[PDB]
Design a protein around this nucleic acid. Structure first.
Ligand SMILES: Nc1nc2c(ncn2[C@H]2CC[C@@H](COP(=O)(O)OP(=O)(O)OP(=O)(O)O)O2)c(=O)[nH]1
Ligand SMILES: [Mg+2]
Length: 639
DNA sequence: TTCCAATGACAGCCGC
DNA sequence: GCGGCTGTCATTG
């Protein structure tokens, strides 16, 4: 039967618990947060409403050890056990000694690591296991796990423990979710037991699938690096953002006024119906869809489709980038600057990492606005700044997905091109626009990039037609030419589809599996979609494995040369100038670090060396390093 | 439904 | 009238 042992109710029970805890190689913890320096627990960063009041420990069966973190006010607190004494014994059991294998199981490890550091001043220092990450590893296309879905799939006999605990069907940890009428003590105790027992079953399934080395050496260390990134945040200049906003808003106003004069009346730029009425019924243009590709053709015939396209581009930068950044920015009183603290998301189809609240990966590339015939550069990335005196360092793998595709297809032509040829997207753009490499603008090089990856990942003549502005038959010939030039690639496509049809899955370089049962489907679309996912998952998933390994290996190196704090949070949670490199953003083939002036040479060497050594392929993994006063103004830096 | 992956606002519809 | 669902359309890699 379910029991909660209140270890802080008696000095003698406490020491017996501490002695037993110090013997464990494996245990679960769950933090207890409730709604309201205080006597009744630790304030949480961002919420004036909720407290960490305790945590629960489990190391087997249906026994939860509830460890209170309240000064005053289950049996009561033994007053000889001061909060300072409890905090000592807590930090002691949660930090590694020398040559001591210890694993802690935490549902939503990242969120718990941060609350323990920032709220309680405790830095977890053991091997971590998150059953959310184990679920992902067993089926990456599964829905995001909840405590309820984990217990349903892996511990179904304990579903009754979750009866009347409706927040177990939300994403957030049951212990962390103070939006319940159940006590933090009960919620954390139930979670501790469900997660410890669930993780035993998830460990057995990882072992059967041969994914346990991936889980311990790549995925959970990757989660630890993402915890440091989320504690670091990324520096943000509200002033740079506002001045860009005002230029963009002035251009939106002039576009609206000119659109409405051409239309003859007001219309909503957000209503496809209104735009269709104006373009096709009122202006009688040739066609009813109002997509990017339609308006891109029609801008050659009338000014209004071009205005529509620019309206959507600029409205996007204002409503989906400026508004959320201004809303989410947060004063860091130590660094003396504003930062943004995005949330990492590792539950993805191919093992990429993305961000939410807000998704900083989607900050526009540089673009141009013309007003009264004067051009203004809008560089939204220029609003992302290092701490005063610091630099932004970006290190990007050159053509990582192409290098992996060369390696797996042994294509001798693609290997030559990458080894000593110029930019392949420039070669494509040059041949296409009847020019030499040098004239290519950013927007044209991106068009060529879309063409090259598009063709490789199974894009058809109809779509290539629209992108290249040529007839299907002309696009179809261009695909044949491309496929003929790189015959190794085409053999690897057919060999990957054959092997997927047989097995029901594809595998990345590290052994992660994606299940594609659409591959057997009789429906031509679903079959072809699965075949395209089969090819793309192997290459894109492999690239995401290499970047994770790089990230983990850089973090180990930074912490050896680490006289000083592993994140900005390790200074917050502490309560001597800034030294070292701070992981601030991942961009799929590119890592951004914020680096102290004195450390930029050494951190640049470490980052480049570790990214180039991540794995050994048939081809060299080339890395370009850039450095600058903002994400928007990065300059080449020879390392 | 015919490049893949991702987040996320927003019309418009409908069952409740 | 409200909330969920489902495309549309944006941007990034
Ligand atoms: N299928 C597909 N993959 C893409 C597309 N754009 C980018 N990717 C993938 C493959 C390359 C990888 C990194 O994106 P980048 O824009 O950096 O591509 P890159 O080849 O490194 O280019 P660059 O040299 O400009 O950094 O993301 C696209 O349009 N389609
Ligand atoms: Mg790149």
């Amino acid at each position: 039967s379910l029991s909660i042992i209140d270890v802080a109710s008696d000095q003698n029970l406490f020491q017996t618990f501490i002695k037993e805890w110090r013997c464990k190689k494996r245990f679960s913890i769950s933090l207890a947060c409730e709604k309201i320096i205080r006597d009744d627990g630790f304030p949480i960063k961002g919420c004036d409403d909720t407290l960490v009041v305790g945590l629960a420990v489990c190391w087997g069966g249906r026994d939860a050890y509830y460890f209170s973190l309240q000064k005053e006010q289950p049996p009561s607190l033994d007053p000889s056990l001061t909060l300072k004494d409890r905090m000592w014994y807590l930090q002691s059991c949660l930090r590694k000694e020398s040559d001591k294998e210890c694993s802690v199981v935490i549902y939503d490890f990242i969120q718990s690591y941060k609350i323990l550091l920032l709220s309680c001043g405790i830095s977890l220092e053991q091997s971590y296991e998150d059953p959310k990450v184990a679920c992902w590893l067993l089926d990456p296309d599964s829905q995001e796990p909840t405590l309820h879905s984990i217990v349903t799939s892996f511990l179904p006999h304990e579903l009754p423990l979750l009866e009347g605990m409706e927040t177990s069907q939300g994403i957030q940890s049951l212990g962390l979710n103070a939006g319940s009428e159940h006590s933090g003590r009960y919620r954390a105790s139930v979670e501790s037991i469900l997660i410890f027992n669930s993780m035993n079953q998830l460990n057995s399934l990882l072992q059967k699938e041969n994914l346990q080395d991936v889980f311990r050496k790549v995925e959970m260390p990757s989660q630890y690096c993402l915890a440091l990134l989320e504690l670091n945040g990324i520096g943000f200049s509200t002033a740079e953002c506002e001045s860009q906003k005002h230029i963009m808003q002035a251009k939106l106003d002039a576009i609206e006024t000119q659109a409405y004069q051409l239309a003859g009346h007001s219309f909503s730029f957000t209503s496809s119906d209104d735009i269709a009425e104006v373009l096709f019924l009122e202006l009688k243009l040739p066609p009813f869809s109002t997509s990017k590709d339609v308006l891109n053709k029609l801008k050659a015939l009338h000014p209004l489709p071009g205005l529509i396209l620019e309206w959507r581009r600029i409205t996007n930068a204002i409503t989906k980038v400026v508004f959320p950044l201004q809303r989410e920015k947060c004063l860091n009183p130590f660094l003396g600057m504003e930062r943004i603290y995005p949330v990492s998301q590792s539950h993805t189809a191919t093992g990429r990492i993305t961000f939410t609240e807000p998704n900083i990966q989607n900050v526009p590339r540089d673009f141009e606005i013309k007003m009264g015939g004067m051009p203004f550069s809008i560089s939204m990335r220029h609003a992302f700044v290092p701490f005063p005196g610091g630099s932004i360092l970006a290190a990007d793998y050159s053509q990582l997905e192409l290098r992996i595709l060369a390696h797996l297809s042994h294509d001798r032509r693609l290997i030559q091109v990458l080894n000593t040829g110029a930019d392949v997207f420039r070669s494509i753009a040059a041949e296409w626009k009847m020019i030499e490499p040098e004239s290519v603008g950013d927007d044209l090089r991106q068009q060529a990039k879309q063409i090259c990856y598009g063709i490789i990942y199974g894009m058809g003549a109809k779509s290539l037609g629209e992108q290249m502005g040529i007839k299907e038959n002309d696009a179809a010939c261009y695909i044949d030419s491309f496929k003929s030039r790189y015959t190794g690639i085409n053999q690897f496509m057919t060999e990957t589809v054959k092997n997927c049809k047989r097995d029901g899955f594809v595998q990345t370089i590290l052994g992660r599996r994606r299940y594609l049962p659409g591959i057997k489907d009789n429906n031509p679309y679903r079959k072809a979609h699965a075949e395209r996912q089969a090819i793309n998952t192997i290459v894109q998933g492999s690239a995401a494995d290499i970047v994770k390994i790089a990230t983990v290996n850089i973090q180990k190196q930074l912490e050896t040369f680490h006289s000083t704090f592993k994140s900005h949070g390790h200074r917050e949670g502490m309560l001597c100038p800034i030294r070292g490199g701070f992981f601030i953003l991942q961009l799929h083939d590119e890592l951004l670090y914020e680096v102290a002036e004195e450390d930029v040479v050494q951190v640049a060497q470490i980052v480049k060396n570790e990214m180039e050594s991540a794995v050994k392929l048939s081809v060299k993994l080339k890395v370009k390093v850039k450095i600058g006063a903002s994400w928007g103004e990065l300059k080449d830096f020879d390392v």
